[PDB]
Amino acid sequence: YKEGICLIDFSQIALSTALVNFPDKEKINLSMVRHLILNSIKFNVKKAKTLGYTKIVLCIDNAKSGYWRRDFAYYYKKTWDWEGYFESSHKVIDELKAYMPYIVMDIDKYEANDHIAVLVKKFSLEGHKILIISSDGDFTQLHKYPNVKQWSPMHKKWVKIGSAEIDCMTKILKGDKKDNVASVKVRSDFWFTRVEGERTPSMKTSIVEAIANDREQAKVLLTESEYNRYKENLVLIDFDYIPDNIASNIVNYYNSYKLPPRGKIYSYFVKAGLSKLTNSINEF
Known part of the structure; x- marks a missing residue:
């Protein structure tokens, strides 16, 4: 078969x-x-x-x-x-x-x-x-x-x-340092060009899960800057x-x-x- x-x-x-x-x-x-x-x-x-x-x-x-x-x-x-x-x-x-x-x-x-x-x-x-x-x-x-x-x-x-969606979205929004994938809160190449005084702003679990259970919510819960980064990371994570x-x-x-x-x-x-x-x- x-x-x-x-x-x-x-x-x-x-x-x-x-x-x-x-x-x-x-x-x-x-x-x-x-x-x-x-x-x-x-x-x-x-x-x-x-x-x-x-x-x-x-x-x-x-x-x-x-x-x-x-x-x-x-x-x-x-x-x-x-x-x-x-x-x-x-x-x-x-x-x-x-x-x-x-x-x-x-x-x-x-x-x-x-x-x-x-x-x-x-x-x-x-x-x-x-x-x-x-x-x-x-x-x-x-x-x-x-x-x-x-x-x-x-x-x-x-x-x-279902809890996998959250896992995925977490890396999508917060990035994955192991691959230099950065958070949506910062500039794309943050990990490569990071200055010492810098570090990443946190991402509230509520927002992460909200977007995870419904991705159309990225358009409203994220800024235009964060939403642009989101669309980038998608190709890198999902x-x-x-x-x-x-x-x-x-x-x-x-x-x-x-x-x-x-x-x-x-x-x-x-x-x-x-x-x-x-x-x-x-x-x-």
Whole structure:
């Protein structure tokens, strides 16, 4: 009928796992990274498939040339062997596109959250049941779509939250410092060009919720200055405001993707000296 689909926020999961597993102040090589990635995939694909989600799509963060969102906001998104990791991870990903039986969503200037957001939308409306593997609360924006569950890999629990509308609107109005997205109360590039004497004016929860439950209320509860910022942040926070062309590109990338026959798997594992895994290919 309609195959269950698991969408894995993979860039987050891989790195997050690496940070926790790879000790600080030690070199990270292509071998360590390969083991960790493939093992992470095995442990997660097993969770997905065991639940009826059999079509696995990996979504990667790619900011080599930046972010398509910077087209609207230039300010958007402006020890440990970080270099060693990214270096080896970028090379293992290419091996995934080559041998592994997964659709790897990888487009320059496109974020994993984009592919997920678009694909979760496309296939939820096509009658499929969708499992999002991620701890990112932002995906609660998609929990509104039918047959959409989210599984936090690290803490091994489900993500259940209408209260998602409030969550979304909060970031839309108050911004998200982690991405340099600013409040509507201040100038767009506040986080990038902030002077020391400055800080952001607060946003009353009443107004946030009022607008959240009814967005037409942004026209009356916000000033013209704040309402202009609102319309900006929408493209930066709300998945619905992902430009059609971006989604169109994402979908087309998914459609045209050619999977490698599972025969390449075994030969690959051995090639990479992963013999202690060729007996678990049935789990990939």
